[PDB]
Input
Amino acid sequence: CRNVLLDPQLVPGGGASEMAVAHALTEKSKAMTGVEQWPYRAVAQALEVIPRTLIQNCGASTIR
Amino acid sequence: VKNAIDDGCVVPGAGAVEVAMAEALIKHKPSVKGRAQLGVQAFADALLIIPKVLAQNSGFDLQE
Output
């Protein structure tokens, strides 16, 4: 409730935010093309947790 | 492939014929001690190794 009070913007769960930011980070890697592009591709890699977590918790194949 | 052109009979591959056995081996047809009903079950379970080893080797599951 306070979170809805704090920001009342409901967000799609699951990997919806994960793979989104990942691209946008790697797109930011493509854009910025600096050194921190690699940290992005390192950080954007962190987003996939929820898919992996959920693919674990469902017991499916993640790589597909 | 010489066994293809010597054979007017041909058996469809990729586990088409094995499920036509393991299922159509539906038991109590060897009801006597069930040892055949188990042995046919045992034999039924070695049939699918081609559907197994591949979905094993290839994507998803030899089982699922």
